């Protein structure tokens, strides 16, 4: 029933403010706790900090003195950012709804219990890197192909991650396989995309992908053919 | 952080041990998740799983303490190979911030894959930007590692070569990349270019010419 | 000692401090957990409350508190006459009196305001005094049906014994195994409050006019509490919440102390050692003793 997805820059120069959101959907904002959780490379699962449905703020010391989480009632949206950014704030980072729990073990007017919270529905992730090198449109370059055949296209020399890629604006979806991209010594990344496909529509039925890069609004689109 | 490797046979009972002992009543959380992908909530409460989740996973409600944290796998798939966190909150510890150390099932026994080899030669319109770089697909391969060897006639080549680590799949096998990047030059006058791939103790080629 | 404060009422302490050994010129550095009520700061260097006026004798862990009856026996050529009257005011003639040898069963209880653990009325709650008149005279209630108050301290105390010297073996307050929880008691309340009517009616049979009950005068903790003993260690219960009527449980914050007076003696304590595991007990409310003002 509630839903949610994150939203971001892609790209951030180091010492400047990151700011990210989240749309929720099919719920109320300010009726559940909201968190925030990044994955960087090599550390594990890092709690940033969490808001209430009271919007009162909690911070991990972590980075209690770098992050504001603000909220927009209005809509169903959440806010996060991040003061003086580094090379190592780069991460996946989610969003993610905190659900109260309240752990009673002796007597509850005594205040022997203890508040624990659980993160129970997540975001997709917004990927954010930190680096001063600035950002680069790619170069898609189509695969021609050859029981059954295989193509794609080369999405070549671009930064930074991620890119997207679709057959046919979502109309061929069995066969796809997006590879993981590879960072060159160049310092940009390269993707590429296949489709095994039927031999008999060779020549017909267009195929026609569509690869989507927003860290520089760089949308293209091309074709395949012998 | 650090990690800690487990290993549990296809369709055995996976027993995974919490990271921090309670020092007192407990409230503990159970995260299945994966490297770039969103995490799952297994369990929430002691052993209080919600929807969706399969009964398979299930964990130790704390009627007496003294009894220790564990998360049960019962029946495990080649699904379940992740990175699972143990969120122990307590009564006498401090706010349970982090997520504790990740231990990484690695279910074991799964049945052996061979690679989809496939060469595509420069495109005509990259070679007509005077730029030539042939990539060779490794798919549906297990378990995830291989060895690429591109080939230029007789001999070999390995300057210019960048290849992908193995990256698991959504049918839980591995897929990995090979680009070879030459000059239009060197692309006409070799005779053709291969790509060996080297799986476990056998080698598959898949080669291509200039034509 | 040097303390600190315990975990991120009943504050505990975390105390390290230099001890002797069983050799004199060799010395160990030994911690220990100490009550707050125990232990007052010099100004966080702290010290045990009983150092500057007396020092202090340990029980020896094998001998026990329980009260067992106690039979007072008069000698050869000596009686003793026993009252058999049951609604007897304890003072003046007595109609049904016969002589015995020796006292009944008596447990040396020791409580303050409620007296647990003794003997009732046959019927009607008697109440007996010397000058009725003269509030500095105690009051003493004798309950007709008792009520049960159910004492427990919750926390799983550990023993920690230290070596002070040769033969000499300190016992000190080892880890708190588990929760940190608030040693307490309960009653029953429409039993308090229906055996705290009982008392009413008679008191106004003396007085006429409203009767209050209200809380402690205030001053030292023996004084103002009920104090009592409960498997081994001594607690100090707030019984503000039992006297607070003017004519589902009721619970009694207590502290548990190891420096005890006991006979407010000049000069003379004992540290109760900690009783490992849990504690619980289970005490009839028999009798009270209370204090009028004017
Ligand atoms: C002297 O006087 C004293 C004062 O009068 C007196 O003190 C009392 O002491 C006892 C123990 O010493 C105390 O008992 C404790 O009580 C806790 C609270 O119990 C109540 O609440 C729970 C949970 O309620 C939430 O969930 C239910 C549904 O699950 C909802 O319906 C509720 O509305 C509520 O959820 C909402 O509210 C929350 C808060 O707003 C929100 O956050 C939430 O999102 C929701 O909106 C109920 O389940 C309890 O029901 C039980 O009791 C009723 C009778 O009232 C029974 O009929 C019924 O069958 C149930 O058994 C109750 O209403 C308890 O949590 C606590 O028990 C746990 O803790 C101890 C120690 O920590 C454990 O050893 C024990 O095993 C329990 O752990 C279980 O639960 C936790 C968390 O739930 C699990 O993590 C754990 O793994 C374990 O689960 C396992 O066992 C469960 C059954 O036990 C089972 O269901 C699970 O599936 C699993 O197998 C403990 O009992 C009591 O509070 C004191 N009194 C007061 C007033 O504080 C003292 O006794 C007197 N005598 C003396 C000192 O001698
Ligand atoms: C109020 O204080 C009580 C302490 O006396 C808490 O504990 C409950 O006391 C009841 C009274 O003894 C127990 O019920 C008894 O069970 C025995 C065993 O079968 C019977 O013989 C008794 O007749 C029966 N008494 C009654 C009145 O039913 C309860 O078992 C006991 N609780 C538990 C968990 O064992 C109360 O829990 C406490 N209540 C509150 C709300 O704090
Ligand atoms: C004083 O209070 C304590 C606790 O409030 C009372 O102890 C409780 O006694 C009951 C008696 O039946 C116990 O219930 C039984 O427990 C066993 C073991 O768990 C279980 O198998 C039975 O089915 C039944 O539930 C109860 O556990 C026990 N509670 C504790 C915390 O020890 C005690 O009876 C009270 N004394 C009085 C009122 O005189
Ligand atoms: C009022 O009387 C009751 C019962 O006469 C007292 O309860 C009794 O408490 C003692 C401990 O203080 C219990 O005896 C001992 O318990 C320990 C701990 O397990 C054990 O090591 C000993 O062997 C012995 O069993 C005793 O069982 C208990 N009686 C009952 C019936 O439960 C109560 O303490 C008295 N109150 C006061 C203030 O003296
Ligand atoms: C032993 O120590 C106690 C506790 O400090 C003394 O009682 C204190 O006396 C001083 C007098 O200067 C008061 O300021 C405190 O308020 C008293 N404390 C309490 C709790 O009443 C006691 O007098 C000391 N004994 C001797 C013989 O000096
Ligand atoms: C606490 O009070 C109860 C109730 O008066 C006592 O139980 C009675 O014990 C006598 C002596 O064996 C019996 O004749 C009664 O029948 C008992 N009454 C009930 C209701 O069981 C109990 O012995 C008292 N305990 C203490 C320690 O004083
Ligand atoms: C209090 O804590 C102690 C541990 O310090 C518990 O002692 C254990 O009790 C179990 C009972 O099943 C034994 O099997 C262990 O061998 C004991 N451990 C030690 C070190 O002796 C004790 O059970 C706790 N008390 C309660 C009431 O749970
Ligand atoms: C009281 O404080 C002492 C510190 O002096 C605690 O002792 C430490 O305990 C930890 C946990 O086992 C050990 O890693 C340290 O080596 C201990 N230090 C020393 C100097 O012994 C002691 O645990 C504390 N007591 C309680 C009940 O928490
Ligand atoms: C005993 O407990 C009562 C509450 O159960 C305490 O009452 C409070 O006392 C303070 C100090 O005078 C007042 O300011 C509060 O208004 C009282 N709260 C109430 C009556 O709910 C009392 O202080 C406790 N006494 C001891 C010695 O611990
Ligand atoms: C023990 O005594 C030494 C001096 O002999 C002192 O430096 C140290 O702090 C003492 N340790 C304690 C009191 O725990
Ligand atoms: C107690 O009752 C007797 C009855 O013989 C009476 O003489 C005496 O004055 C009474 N004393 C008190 C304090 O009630
Ligand atoms: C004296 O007490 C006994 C006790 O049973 C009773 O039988 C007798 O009737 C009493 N006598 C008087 C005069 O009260
Ligand atoms: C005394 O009684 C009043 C009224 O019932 C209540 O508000 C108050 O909390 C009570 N005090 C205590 C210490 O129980």
């Known amino acids: 029933q509630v839903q949610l997805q994150e939203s971001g820059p892609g790209l951030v120069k180091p010492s400047e403010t990151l700011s990210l959101t989240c749309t929720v959907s099919g719920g109320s904002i300010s009726n559940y706790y909201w968190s925030w959780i990044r994955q960087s490379p090599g550390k594990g699962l890092e709690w940033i900090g969490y808001i209430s449905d009271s919007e009162s703020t909690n911070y991990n010391p972590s980075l209690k003195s770098r992050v504001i989480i603000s909220v927009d009632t209005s809509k169903n949206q959440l806010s996060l950012k991040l003061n003086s950014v580094t090379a190592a704030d780069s991460a996946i980072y989610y969003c993610?709804?905190?659900?109260?729990?309240?752990?009673?073990?002796?007597?509850?007017?005594?205040?022997?219990?203890?508040?624990?919270?659980?993160?129970?529905?997540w975001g997709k992730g917004t990927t954010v890197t930190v680096s001063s090198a600035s950002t680069k449109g790619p170069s898609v370059f189509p695969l021609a192909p050859s029981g059954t055949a295989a193509l794609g296209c080369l999405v070549k020399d671009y930064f930074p991650e991620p890119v997207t890629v679709s057959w046919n604006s979502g109309a061929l979806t069995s066969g796809v396989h997006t590879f993981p991209a590879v960072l060159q010594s160049s310092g940009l990344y390269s993707l590429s995309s296949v489709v095994t496909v039927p031999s008999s529509s060779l020549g017909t039925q267009t195929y026609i992908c569509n690869v989507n890069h927003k860290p520089s609004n760089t949308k293209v689109d091309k074709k395949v053919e012998p | 952080s650090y990690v800690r490797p487990l290993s549990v046979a296809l369709g055995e009972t996976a027993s995974i041990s919490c990271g921090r002992q309670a020092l007192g009543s407990r409230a503990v959380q159970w995260y299945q998740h994966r490297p770039g992908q969103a995490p799952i909530l297994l369990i929430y409460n002691n052993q209080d799983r919600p929807s969706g989740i399969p009964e398979r996973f299930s964990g130790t409600p704390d009627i007496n303490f003294g009894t220790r944290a564990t998360l049960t796998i019962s029946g495990v798939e080649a699904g379940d190979e992740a990175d699972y966190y143990c969120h122990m909150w307590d009564s006498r510890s401090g706010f349970s911030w982090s997520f504790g150390g990740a231990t990484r099932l690695t279910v074991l026994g799964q049945p052996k894959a061979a690679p989809s080899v496939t060469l595509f030669p420069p495109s005509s319109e990259e070679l007509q930007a005077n730029k030539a770089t042939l990539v060779c697909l490794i798919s549906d391969f297990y378990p995830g590692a291989v060895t690429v060897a591109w080939k230029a006639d007789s001999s070999p080549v390995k300057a210019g070569v960048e290849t992908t680590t193995p990256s698991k799949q959504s049918n839980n096998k591995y897929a990995a990349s090979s680009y070879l990047s030459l000059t239009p030059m060197q692309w006409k006058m070799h005779k053709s270019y291969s790509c060996q791939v080297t799986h476990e103790g056998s080698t598959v080629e898949k080669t291509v010419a200039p034509t | 000692l040097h303390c600190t404060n315990f975990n991120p009422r009943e504050e505990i302490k975390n105390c390290s401090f230099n001890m002797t050994t069983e050799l004199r010129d060799k010395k160990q550095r030994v911690h220990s957990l100490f009550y707050k009520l125990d232990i007052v700061q010099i100004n966080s260097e702290y010290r045990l409350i009983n150092c500057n006026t007396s020092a202090c004798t340990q029980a020896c862990p094998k001998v026990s508190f329980e009260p067992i009856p106690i039979h007072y026996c008069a000698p050869a050529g000596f009686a003793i006459l026993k009252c058999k009257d049951e609604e007897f005011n304890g003072t003046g003639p007595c109609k049904n009196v016969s002589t015995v040898q020796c006292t009944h069963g008596i447990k040396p209880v020791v409580s303050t305001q409620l007296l647990l653990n003794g003997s009732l009325a046959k019927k009607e709650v008697k109440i007996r005094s010397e000058n009725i008149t003269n509030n500095v005279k105690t009051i003493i209630v004798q309950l007709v049906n008792p009520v049960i108050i159910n004492c427990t301290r919750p926390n799983n105390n550990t023993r920690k014994s230290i070596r002070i010297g040769p033969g000499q073996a300190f016992y000190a307050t080892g880890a708190i195994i588990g929760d940190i929880r608030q040693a307490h008691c309960n009653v029953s309340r429409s039993d308090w409050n229906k055996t705290l009517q009982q008392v009413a009616r008679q008191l106004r049979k003396h007085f006429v006019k409203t009767i209050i009950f209200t809380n402690s005068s205030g001053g030292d903790l023996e004084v103002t509490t009920h104090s009592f003993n409960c498997g081994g260690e001594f607690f100090y219960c707030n019984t503000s919440g039992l006297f607070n009527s003017t004519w589902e449980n009721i619970t009694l914050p207590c502290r548990i102390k190891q420096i005890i007076n006991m006979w407010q003696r000049t000069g003379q304590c004992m540290y109760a050692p900690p009783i490992p595991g849990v504690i619980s007990c289970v005490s009839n409310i028999t009798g009270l003793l209370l204090t009028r003002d004017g």
């Open positions: 993610a709804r905190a659900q109260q729990g309240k752990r009673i073990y002796g007597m509850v007017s005594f205040g022997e219990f203890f508040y624990y919270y659980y993160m129970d529905v």
